[PDB]
Design a protein around this ligand. Structure first.
Ligand code: IVO
Lengths: 381, 74
């Protein structure tokens, strides 16, 4: 255990608010009443200060509760945690906003043990939560290799984790919204010289692809800044290729999710995803489509847009490594232009290449790219 | 051969995600660092975080169950 300060809270909040971010704060679940019931006193204090300060903040309780026993030699069944969540819910409603949110229970991924705990928790506590949170990592960082990052079989395991979660949630709280609460490439602080590279982007972009297509409403990346190799921003506050990928995604990809698929249909290496174009982007209209694609082949592939889209004008946003280290590189170029900050207060333009109208979509070996179909005029979008 | 044709489904939206879909976390262990004050005050880092708005910032992690609020600490 360690103690933290009001000083810590103020900074953490201010950083969220000045960054245009809704902070969610996880609370300590291992503080316990003699009978193994959750003592609410520390949070109560913290809630009051935050009430005192007028901070609009959202809350979680516990982390990886499936692991308390190995992690602290205290076993809490879900029911118990469910009661505990009800108590937390009592407290937030009594306090200043009370139209403020609560999520949980942040259990690790579908494990045959972890499903039991989540099910029992959603029976008891499914009622108070505004979203369901789980975690996912692909590999153990200490033993993760470079081929893994390029292995479509590794990517696809993610799907059964997802199917298994919705299997549990539909049994208890259908219509309840599901969130990837903490997630990444490799656990144990990341795979060294892999989790912080261009190669990490095959996993991250596919994770966002699969999640959007399978009903995950929010995906929370471990981490933005920190010790772990899986940071979006490094030790010296430099953006890593995942940060540049993540920017591009937010600016280009919409909330309305669609579907694309390959007519070939055998090899697992050409992954494609389709959303409405993020309307907010000043370059586009509504009705335009945003296609993102990963190529895990060791040669270039050229995609053909289908009727009646075969003859439309397309902006291409191709990402490839900045050498000499290639896929293990920590710099990345967009359409052949290295991406860097202009200075410490200013991001550069992300510039497209307007493609030819009717041209097929070149996607080179081990690359990922976005393509915005301009003048698509789709009605759902 | 290197030409692949794609199928699309554009009739209606299959899922609706949050404008905050792509979100991030700060690990609770970052509060065991002595440089917490300095790192989050960085204007460069805040700039990067603003390019990711709108989004949720989740402060938690394994260390969530080992932080004790102390009112007499600053
Ligand atoms: O070990 C990690 O990389 C992180 C670890 O650093 C986090 O604190 C913990 O919540 C976790 N669960 C799965 C992975 N992780």
């Amino acid at each position: 255990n360690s103690t933290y300060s009001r000083s810590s809270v103020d900074v953490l909040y201010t950083f969220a608010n000045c960054s245009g971010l809704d902070l969610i704060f996880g609370l300590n679940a291992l503080l316990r009443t003699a009978d193994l019931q959750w003592n609410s006193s520390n949070a109560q204090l913290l809630l009051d200060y935050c009430s005192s300060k007028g901070y609009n903040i959202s809350w979680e309780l516990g982390n990886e509760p499936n692991s308390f026993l190995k992690k602290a030699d205290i076993f809490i069944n879900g029911s118990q945690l469910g009661e505990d969540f009800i108590q937390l819910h009592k407290l937030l409603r009594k306090s200043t906003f009370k139209n403020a949110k609560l999520y949980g229970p942040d259990v690790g991924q579908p494990r045959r043990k972890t499903a039991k705990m989540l099910k029992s928790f959603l029976k008891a506590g499914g009622e108070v939560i505004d979203s369901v949170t789980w975690h996912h990592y692909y590999l153990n960082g200490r033993t993760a290799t470079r081929e893994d990052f390029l292995n479509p079989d590794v990517l696809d395991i993610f799907i059964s984790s997802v199917q298994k979660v919705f299997q549990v949630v539909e049994s208890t709280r259908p219509g309840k919204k599901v969130w990837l609460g903490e997630t990444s490439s490799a656990y144990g602080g990341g795979a060294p010289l892999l989790s912080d590279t261009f190669a990490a982007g095959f996993m991250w972009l596919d994770k966002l692809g699969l999640s959007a297509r399978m009903g995950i409403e929010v995906v929370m990346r471990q981490v933005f800044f920190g010790a772990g190799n899986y940071h979006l921003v490094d030790e010296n506050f430099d953006p890593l290729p995942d940060y540049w990928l993540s920017l591009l995604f937010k600016k280009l990809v919409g909330t309305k999710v669609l579907m694309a698929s390959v007519q070939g249909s055998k090899r697992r290496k050409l992954r494609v995803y389709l959303h409405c174009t993020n309307t907010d982007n000043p370059r586009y209209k509504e009705g335009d489509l945003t296609l993102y694609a990963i190529n895990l082949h060791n040669v270039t592939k050229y995609l053909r847009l289908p009727y009646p889209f075969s003859n439309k004008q397309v902006d291409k946003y191709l990402l490839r490594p900045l050498g000499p280290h290639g896929l293990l590189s920590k710099s990345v170029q967009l359409n052949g232009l290295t991406l860097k900050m202009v200075d410490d207060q200013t991001l550069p333009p992300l510039m497209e290449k307007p493609l030819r109208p009717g041209s097929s979509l070149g996607l080179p070996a081990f690359s990922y790219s976005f393509f915005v179909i301009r003048n698509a005029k789709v009605a759902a979008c | 051969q290197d030409v692949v044709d794609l199928d699309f489904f554009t009739q209606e939206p299959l899922h609706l995600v949050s404008p905050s879909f792509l979100s991030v976390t700060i690990d609770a262990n970052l509060a065991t660092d002595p440089r917490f004050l300095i790192l989050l005050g960085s204007p460069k880092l805040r700039t990067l975080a603003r390019g990711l708005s709108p989004a949720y910032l989740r402060f938690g992690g394994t260390k969530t169950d080992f932080l004790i609020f102390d009112p007499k600490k600053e």
